[PDB]
Design an enzyme around this catalytic site. Structure first.
Site, PDB file in Angstrom:
ATOM      1  N   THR A  35      93.669  -7.439 -32.076  1.00  0.00           N
ATOM      2  CA  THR A  35      94.775  -6.658 -31.540  1.00  0.00           C
ATOM      3  C   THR A  35      95.843  -6.454 -32.609  1.00  0.00           C
ATOM      4  OG1 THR A  35      95.990  -8.635 -30.710  1.00  0.00           O
ATOM      5  CG2 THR A  35      94.498  -7.501 -29.176  1.00  0.00           C
ATOM      6  N   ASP A  36      96.719  -5.477 -32.380  1.00  0.00           N
ATOM      7  CA  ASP A  36      97.989  -5.469 -33.085  1.00  0.00           C
ATOM      8  C   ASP A  36      98.840  -6.649 -32.534  1.00  0.00           C
ATOM      9  OD1 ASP A  36     100.090  -4.727 -34.791  1.00  0.00           O
ATOM     10  OD2 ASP A  36      99.813  -2.573 -34.439  1.00  0.00           O
ATOM     11  N   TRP A  37      99.894  -7.015 -33.235  1.00  0.00           N
ATOM     12  CA  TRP A  37     100.595  -8.269 -32.957  1.00  0.00           C
ATOM     13  C   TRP A  37     101.442  -8.252 -31.666  1.00  0.00           C
ATOM     14  CZ3 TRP A  37      97.413  -8.880 -36.522  1.00  0.00           C
ATOM     15  CH2 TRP A  37      97.288 -10.073 -37.233  1.00  0.00           C
TER      16      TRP A  37
END
Ligand code: GAL
Length: 795
Positions: A705-707
């Site tokens: 995922t993105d953060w």
């Protein structure tokens, strides 16, 4: 085994990239600056050189930044007007550089110093030439904006330029910018020379001085089309809405739109750049091989001017309009020459496979729905210096369609909208008409159930190590049996930021994020930002490299790959296995704030540059993570924005660069987005992460995922702890949680597994992706005591 990282060669590699990526737009001979000349430098930003944009990909800590005034002095070819420097220095003590209050709050530009008739007139009397520096930065969460101080000049900037123009008859203008800005008012004032110097990292000034003084001849080229007005861009109409944007322009992005429908709206075409010399491009031999699905084009580039230099041969294909409609030209190949001495020449030969100019049939009008196809008709190849000034090189004609690849109905739009269509009026001009985009009819639940992986029966007495999988002793399936449901729910969690399992100040750890997983010899693998160099929030220093747009403007994959071969060693030295880059989203609109760390409006170039960066990182066994997959072309509202886009536009434009990164770059790790593509979040999209990425392109790796990204099931509410949705899509890693073994985020992996709404086989699939990746990293080699040790020299 031990290896030297020579810091002076690393500086020199980065300096070459800066010197091949500056783009000279206009010049009447005032550049290069003459031996012994004295230069007056204007613009306050001269003291605070923008080495990068703002955000995650621009917080590389460094000991020193060589700006433009310093690089010029170190050239020993000119001297700088030191009085004028002191006026700026003394003024700046009363008006300090604004660094902002936090994350995305550092401003686009700094307020300029007002100049007087007095200061400028005096500077003129004591110097041979003026250099005016205009500075802009941008980044995460702030979109660039069509206003004074951002895309446009401020009133004081415009004043500065007019005064300088009046009092000097030699005037150079440098744009120290992350992305394109308005050139209308600059061109009207009419400086002698205009150069885009981008943001060159910590040695930007060294490589920028090189081109300014003629030690290196500018050879940089535009990766986007510069139109006259922001409203001329086809995406502008449908860009900047925080909730939803319709990609009505479809495949007609950038030069795909302008060369096809609106030639007059272009000031500088895609691939434009000039030099201190002049080149003659002579068309050569042309052959096609329809059974191999390739053509071969030759041409010869000759230096017809008085100084040595490089040029770029760019090759374009015009496909027959057929039933789908095509852009007038699409880039399919390019080659930069060696340094050519006056009157010398180089033969350039390229071989182009037909898949570089195929078209995706999303409506079925070719009789091959969900296929890449070459429609019947005439294919013309063009060769030249840029897309506009490209000339007929060869042609071939196909009597029947050729289907290049059979794919499927994936990631299709969930609502109807109108898209652009190339319609040929009866005089053969192409004009814009609109057509309905067909709505998806995929049954997603069935697709997931029909392709459900097979569960591996658990066995907790099997004490096989991940070392035994690596050695060849056992199958990965045999090892993964050992993982409990606690272990399986744990391994799909990334720990960060600043987990203590890995180097301090990095973005995450993954793999061995529990004591139980570490006992299996799953190592803790370290991720860190970013494309322009290592961000270490501990404050430790690292190499700050040029921004992505400058990398792309080299049109030179070899120079980029050499630089990142050094970054490969720096990463091992800092025990970082995964660099969070390249950023390689398409430049859909000039006003996107993160354009600085992406490459191009063209997907072939975008993919080719990304692949160069990856081959660099792979040299000594480090790795990159392609991001953000896909359609993150806008920063405003990016936590929820819905990109509504057709399959054809997705297959030919937005996904294509990522496809190239997989098939040519060897990419083994991808990062999803914060936003939605066609009505759901990307982290939980089955079509994106399994169908397209794995089944269709053959990717063998990890998706993360993105953060702190949101995830959902289609129709459902977004949350930052719906990891079961994420695992059902084969997004393998939630980034990030403070403590993974304790399920700090209270994710739903285990509760959904007890209810049967998540199958054990799906968790095991992710764990095998994570483990197979992890065993080939440098962190695995440390456990095995067969890793590369790096020493730094030249400091
Ligand atoms: O800090 C790590 C991450 O940060 C996010 O905020 C950003 O969108 C990504 O590019 C990723 O690298």
């Amino acid at each position: 085994e031990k290896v030297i990282l020579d810091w002076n060669e690393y500086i020199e590699a980065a300096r070459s990239v800066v010197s091949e990526g500056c783009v000279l737009l206009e010049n009447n001979g005032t550049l290069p600056l003459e031996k012994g000349a004295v230069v007056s430098i204007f613009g306050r930003i001269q003291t605070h050189y923008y080495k990068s944009g703002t955000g995650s990909g621009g917080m590389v800590n460094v000991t020193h930044v060589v700006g433009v005034p310093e690089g010029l002095k170190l050239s020993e070819h000119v001297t700088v007007n030191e009085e004028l420097e002191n006026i700026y220095k003394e003024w700046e003590e009363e008006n300090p550089f604004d660094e902002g209050l936090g994350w995305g709050t550092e401003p686009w530009s700094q307020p300029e110093m007002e100049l007087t008739d007095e200061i400028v007139s005096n500077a003129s009397a004591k110097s041979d030439v003026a250099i005016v520096i205009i500075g802009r930065t941008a980044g995460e969460d702030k979109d660039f904006s069509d206003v004074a101080g951002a895309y446009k000049l401020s009133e004081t900037e415009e004043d500065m330029l007019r005064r300088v123009r009046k009092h000097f008859d030699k005037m150079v203008v440098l744009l120290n910018v992350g992305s394109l800005m308005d050139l209308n008012v600059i061109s009207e004032i009419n400086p002698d020379a205009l150069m885009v110097i981008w943001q060159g990292g910590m040695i930007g000034g060294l490589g920028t001085a090189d081109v300014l003084t003629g030690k290196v001849n500018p050879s940089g080229k535009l990766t986007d089309t510069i139109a006259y007005e922001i409203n001329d861009y086809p995406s502008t109409e449908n860009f900047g809405d925080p909730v939803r944007d319709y990609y009505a322009e479809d495949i007609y992005v950038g030069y795909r739109y302008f060369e096809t429908f609106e030639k007059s709206k272009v000031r500088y075409p895609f691939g434009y750049g000039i030099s201190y010399t002049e080149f003659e491009h002579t068309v050569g031999e042309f052959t096609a091989d329809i059974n191999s699905r390739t053509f071969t084009a030759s041409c010869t580039v000759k230096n017809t001017g008085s100084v040595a230099g490089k040029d770029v041969a760019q090759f374009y294909v015009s496909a027959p309009q057929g039933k789908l409609g095509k852009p007038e030209k699409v880039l399919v190949a390019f080659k930069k020459t060696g340094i050519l001495n006056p009157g010398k020449e180089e033969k350039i030969t390229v071989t182009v496979p037909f898949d570089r100019f195929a078209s995706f049939d999303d409506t079925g009008v070719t009789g091959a729905e969900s296929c890449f196809v070459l429609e019947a008709g005439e294919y013309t190849v063009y060769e030249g210096k840029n897309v506009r000034e490209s000339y007929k090189e060869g042609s071939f004609t196909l009597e029947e369609n050729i289907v290049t690849e059979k794919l499927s109905k994936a990631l299709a739009p969930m609502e109807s909208f109108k898209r652009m269509k190339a319609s040929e009026n009866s005089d053969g001009t192409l004009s814009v008409k609109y057509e309905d985009v067909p709505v998806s009819d995929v049954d997603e639940k069935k697709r997931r159930l029909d392709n459900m992986p097979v569960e591996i029966p658990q066995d907790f007495t099997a004490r096989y190590s991940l070392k035994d999988v690596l050695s060849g002793s056992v199958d990965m399936e045999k090892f993964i049996a050992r993982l409990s449901d606690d272990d399986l729910a744990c391994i799909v969690r990334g720990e960060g930021m600043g987990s203590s399992l890995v180097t301090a100040g990095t973005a995450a750890a993954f793999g061995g994020v529990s004591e139980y997983l570490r006992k299996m010899d799953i190592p803790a693998v370290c991720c860190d930002d970013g494309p322009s160099g290592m961000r270490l929030d501990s404050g430790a220093t690292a190499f700050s490299m040029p921004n992505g747009t400058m990398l792309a403007s080299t049109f030179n994959p070899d120079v980029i790959e050499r630089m990142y071969g050094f970054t490969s060693l720096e990463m091992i030295y800092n025990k970082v296995e995964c660099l969070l880059g390249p950023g390689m989203n398409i430049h859909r609109n000039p006003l996107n704030g993160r354009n600085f760390e992406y490459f191009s409006e063209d997907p072939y170039l975008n993919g080719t540059i990304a692949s160069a960066m990856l081959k660099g990182l792979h040299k000594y066994g480090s790795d990159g993570v392609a991001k953000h997959f896909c359609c993150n072309n806008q920063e405003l509202g990016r936590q929820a924005c819905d990109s509504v886009v057709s399959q054809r536009a997705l297959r030919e434009i937005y996904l294509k660069g990522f496809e190239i990164a997989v098939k040519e770059g060897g990419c083994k790790a991808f990062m999803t987005t914060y936003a939605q593509v066609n009505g759901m979040w990307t982290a939980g999209n089955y079509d994106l992460n399994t169908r397209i990425l794995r089944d269709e392109w053959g990717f063998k790796g990890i998706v993360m995922t993105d953060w702190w990204a949101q995830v959902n099931d289609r129709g459902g509410e977004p949350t930052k702890n719906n990891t079961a949705a994420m695992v059902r899509a084969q997004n393998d890693l939630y980034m990030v949680t403070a403590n993974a073994a304790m399920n700090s985020a209270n994710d739903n992996t285990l509760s959904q597994l007890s209810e049967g709404k998540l199958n054990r086989a799906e968790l095991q699939r992710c764990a095998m992706n994570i483990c197979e990746y992890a065993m080939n990293t440098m962190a695995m080699k440390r456990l095995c005591r067969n890793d590369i040790k790096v020493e730094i020299a030249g400091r």
